[PDB]
Structures are given as structure tokens and as C-alpha cells.
A paper describes a structure:
Here we present a fluorescent genetically encoded biosensor, Hypocrates, for the visualization of (pseudo)hypohalous acids and their derivatives. Wild-type NemR contains several redox-active Cys residues and is sensitive to reactive chlorine species, including HOCl and chloramines, as well as to some electrophiles. Therefore, to develop a biosensor specific for HOCl, we use NemR with only a single cysteine, Cys106 (NemRC106).
To inactivate the sensor, we substituted the key Cys355 residue with a Ser and obtained the HypocratesCS variant, which is insensitive to (pseudo)hypohalous acids and their derivatives. Since its spectral properties and pH sensitivity are identical to the parameters of the original indicator, HypocratesCS is the most appropriate pH control. As such, the insertion of cpYFP had only a minor structural effect on the overall structure of the NemR-sensor domain. The chromophore is in cis-configuration and consists of an imidazolinone ring connected to a planar 4-hydroxybenzyl ring. The 4-hydroxybenzyl ring of the chromophore is stabilized by π-π stacking interaction with the phenyl-ring of Phe164, which has an off-centered parallel orientation to the 4-hydroxybenzyl ring. Asn95 is located on the connecting loop between the α4 helix of the NemR-sensor domain and the N-terminus of the cpYFP domain. Asn95 interacts with the backbone of Gln96 and Phe97 in the NemR-sensor domain, and with Ser166, a conserved serine of the ESPT pathway in fluorescent proteins. Further inspection of the structure showed that non-covalent interface interactions between cpYFP β-barrel and the NemR-sensor domain are relatively limited.
Author numbering: 8 to 40, 44 to 192, 208 to 271, 275 to 448
Write the structure that this text describes.
């Protein structure tokens, strides 16, 4: 559909450029399409793009708050929870959901396999797809837990050390297993905070490079903190393309799922993690990593080979955004100022449809004893919206999980489970 394609394109463009900065020629270029054929003006296009965006988000909020997992309180917490991820985002869902990687047993190999799509943002507004095909196999001979089908929820943010001169990446991940409704000796090595060492030897199209990182992971909270330095000069590829290559052992497996943690069970001997990553319309990475304990440190030692890249493509030409975009509602909330009145009204109605959804959830949860809170639904809905808006925004400025963690902790406190 031509009209949908333009609106979809213009949303991504605004997600990155903003609306007032999105030019019409740049929109038809990236969309490969004219224009007044389908829209009266850029202003009318913007109203339509806004109404389309909020219609999809109201529907996403509706099925979460009225039909999601758990009770009304759990759904309200998830309304915050699904916004922590700032990596691999696109389209109507960008800034609204974590990235779920489906884990599956590979009994033939006594390990696990996965396949998933990573989406990088090209600075021109198009999206670089990266198809991951992954196999993991124990290094040791000891028995390993072979899991039933589940997934790992990945939430990541990339930042920079302001004192670091070298080409480098700061990477923070929150990773949680889920998908099963109702351990091992290796599990015991992860009860506390564990030093990490990462080493990558890379060769992409003949450009060699070495990446060396150090950090710590906290599996009880599914937390991973790394700072990775390119030790041979400029990284000849965009840092976002190495994120998945540069520790699923640090995932938080909830109590009822401990029998399905293959990654901790293979420890301390460890496991081999192999991938092919197919970059659409470009080349591919093949990676081989040993993840294992060396003394008290968890080591991820990696070799990487890339063949078939375009020297002027998105990867070798460094055309990839380093940061996530976040959501459009926050990106454009930021933009009211120069907007037309018809589009000022469009955000107003979009933000109010969200608040109304939060209010119904608070009211319904009261009535069915999912939750108690001091205040009334509509006013409390507005406080929750504002907190959600400020926290996401401040999570983007600081490139950190802290604001949403603190905000979510606040929400658990004020939207309480009723006394027994």
C-alpha cells in the first residue's frame, strides 16, 4: 500500500530527524515513491502519521492493560517495563518493547539454537536488518540442562565514557528468561557479582581489528555491564553491529525456570557460541566464541570473520546510528513548539487516549482488588504518564537504565498489592 508505505517511512524519518526537520524530498527518496498524489501537504501528512502512530500504540496498550499477563498491577508495571530497551528498534513498536530471542533445545548437539532478527537504524531513515543464526554447544562433558522452548528478553543501551579517548563502547544489558508458566552446580558460580573479560579478534573484508573489554555481570538481576575498547585504532565496523557478539549466562532465570538454564549449567567448563549474521543486501559475520571461567573471571573469547561487505555499504561505510531512537510519542512530545495546531491537537488526543487507558486499568484494578493507591484513577493515570514520559526521556539523555529503574520502583511502591 503506497499510502501506508509513506506514513511508515515518514514515522521512521521523524523518529530520527524529527518532524519539522523531515524534508519531503528526503521522504520520497527513502520511501522510493510525487507525494501530493496522496496527501494535501506535509502538515496533513503529519496529522495522518500521528493518528496512525497513536492508533497502533493505543491498541498495543489496550491488549496489554486489558488482556496482558498477570493482574492489572502487573500490566501497569509492564507499561514501564517494556520501555527499558534502547537497542534494535524500528517502526510502531520502537521504544515500546524489549527484543525477545527464542531459545530452543538442539538435542542433536547437546546444546541450544536460536534465530532472531536485529534491526539497526541507518542514518537516512531506512533499517539495516541483521539475521542471526546461533548454535551453542557445551565445551565440557558433564551433564547439561537441555531446556524446553522459552525466550530471553534483551534490553540494552549503548553509551560512551566521557574520559575515554580510544574508540570504545559502553554496553549495558538487562536479560530475563520467560515463556514457561508453571538447578545445577554451575548456577552457584553466578550467585554474586562476577568479573568479565571479553576478547575479540576480527577480520572484516581484510580489515583486521581487536576488541578488548572488561566488566561485571549480576545474574540474580540479569544485569551486564561492559566497556569495550578497540585496541588497534578505529573500529572498521559500527559498534552496534558487534553488540550481540560481545553473555547469556548472566540472564535472570526465574525460580520456576531454573531447570531450563543451559548456559549456567555448562559452567565452569563453558560453552561454544557460534553465529552467522546475515546483513541484508550486504555481507555476513561468522563468529565463534568460548564462554567459560578462567579462575574467578567469566571470559568471552571471540574470533570473527566477515566476507562479502560493500566498502560503501551501511557497515563498512559507518552509516549506522550508535543510539536507539526511543519512541515517537516521546520524540515528538519533545517537538511541540513549531508544530501546527492540527498536530498539537493530534498529540493532545494521543496522549489523552493513553492516560484514559491507564485510568481504566487503575479503576479496574481497584474494583477487582489487584491494587490499591492513594488518589483517583484519572489524576493518578496522569502522574503515571508524566513519570513514564520524564523517565524515558531522562533514560535517553543519560543512556542508562537508572531513571526507569527508579521510576518503576516508585510505581511498585505507590500502586500496591492489597493487604492480605
Amino acid at each position: 500500500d503506497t499510502r501506508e508505505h509513506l506514513l511508515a517511512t515518514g514515522e521512521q524519518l521523524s523518529l530520527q530527524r524529527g518532524f519539522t526537520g523531515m524534508g519531503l524530498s528526503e521522504l520520497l527518496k527513502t520511501a522510493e515513491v510525487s507525494f501530493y498524489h496522496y496527501f494535501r501537504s506535509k502538515e496533513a501528512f503529519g496529522v495522518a502519521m500521528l493518528e496512525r502512530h497513536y492508533a497502533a500504540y493505543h491498541q498495543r496498550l489496550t491488549e496489554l492493560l486489558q488482556s496482558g499477563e498477570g493482574n492489572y498491577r502487573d500490566r501497569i508495571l509492564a507499561y514501564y517495563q517494556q520501555t527499558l530497551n534502547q537497542f534494535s528498534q524500528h517502526g510502531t513498536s520502537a521504544g515500546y518493547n524489549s527484543d525477545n530471542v527464542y531459545i530452543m533445545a538442539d538435542k542433536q548437539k547437546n546444546g541450544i539454537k536460536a534465530n532472531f532478527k536485529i534491526r539497526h537504524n541507518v542514518e537516512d531513515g531506512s533499517v539495516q536488518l541483521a539475521d542471526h543464526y546461533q548454535q551453542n554447544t557445551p565445551i565440557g562433558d558433564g551433564p547439561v540442562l537441555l531446556p524446553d522452548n522459552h525466550y530471553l528478553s534483551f534490553q540494552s543501551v549503548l553509551s560512551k565514557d566521557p574520559n575515554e579517548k580510544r574508540d570504545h563502547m559502553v554496553l549495558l544489558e538487562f536479560v530475563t528468561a520467560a515463556g514457561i508458566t508453571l538447578g545445577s552446580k554451575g548456577e552457584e558460580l553466578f550467585t554474586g557479582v562476577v568479573p568479565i573479560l571479553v576478547e575479540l579478534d576480527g577480520d572484516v573484508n581484510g580489515h583486521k581489528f581487536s576488541v578488548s573489554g572488561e566488566g561485571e555481570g549480576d545474574a540474580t538481576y540479569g544485569k551486564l555491564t561492559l566497556k569495550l575498547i578497540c585496541t588497534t585504532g578505529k573500529l572498521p565496523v559500527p559498534w552496534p553491529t558487534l553488540v550481540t557478539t560481545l553473555l547469556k549466562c548472566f540472564a535472570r532465570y526465574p525460580d520456576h525456570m531454573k531447570q531450563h538454564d543451559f548456559f549456567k549449567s555448562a559452567m565452569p567448563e563453558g560453552y561454544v557460541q557460534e553465529r552467522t549474521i546475515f546483513f541484508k543486501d550486504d555481507g555476513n559475520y561468522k563468529t565463534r566464541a568460548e564462554v567459560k571461567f578462567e579462575g574467578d573471571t567469566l571470559v568471552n573469547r571471540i574470533e570473527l570473520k566477515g566476507i562479502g561487505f560493500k566498502e560503501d555499504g551501511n557497515i563498512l561505510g559507518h552509516k549506522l546510528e550508535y543510539n536507539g531512537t526511543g519512541s515517537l510519542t516521546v520524540k515528538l512530545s519533545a517537538e511541540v513548539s513549531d508544530l501546527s495546531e492540527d498536530m498539537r491537537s493530534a498529540m493532545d488526543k494521543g496522549a489523552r487516549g493513553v492516560i484514559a487507558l491507564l485510568s481504566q486499568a487503575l479503576e479496574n484494578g481497584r474494583e477487582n482488588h489487584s491494587l490499591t493507591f492513594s488518589g483517583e484513577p484519572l489524576q493518578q493515570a496522569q502522574v503515571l504518564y508524566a513519570l513514564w514520559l520524564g523517565a524515558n526521556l531522562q533514560a535517553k539523555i543519560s543512556r542508562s537504565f537508572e531513571p526507569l529503574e527508579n521510576a518503576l520502583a516508585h510505581v511498585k511502591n505507590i500502586i500496591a498489592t492489597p493487604a492480605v
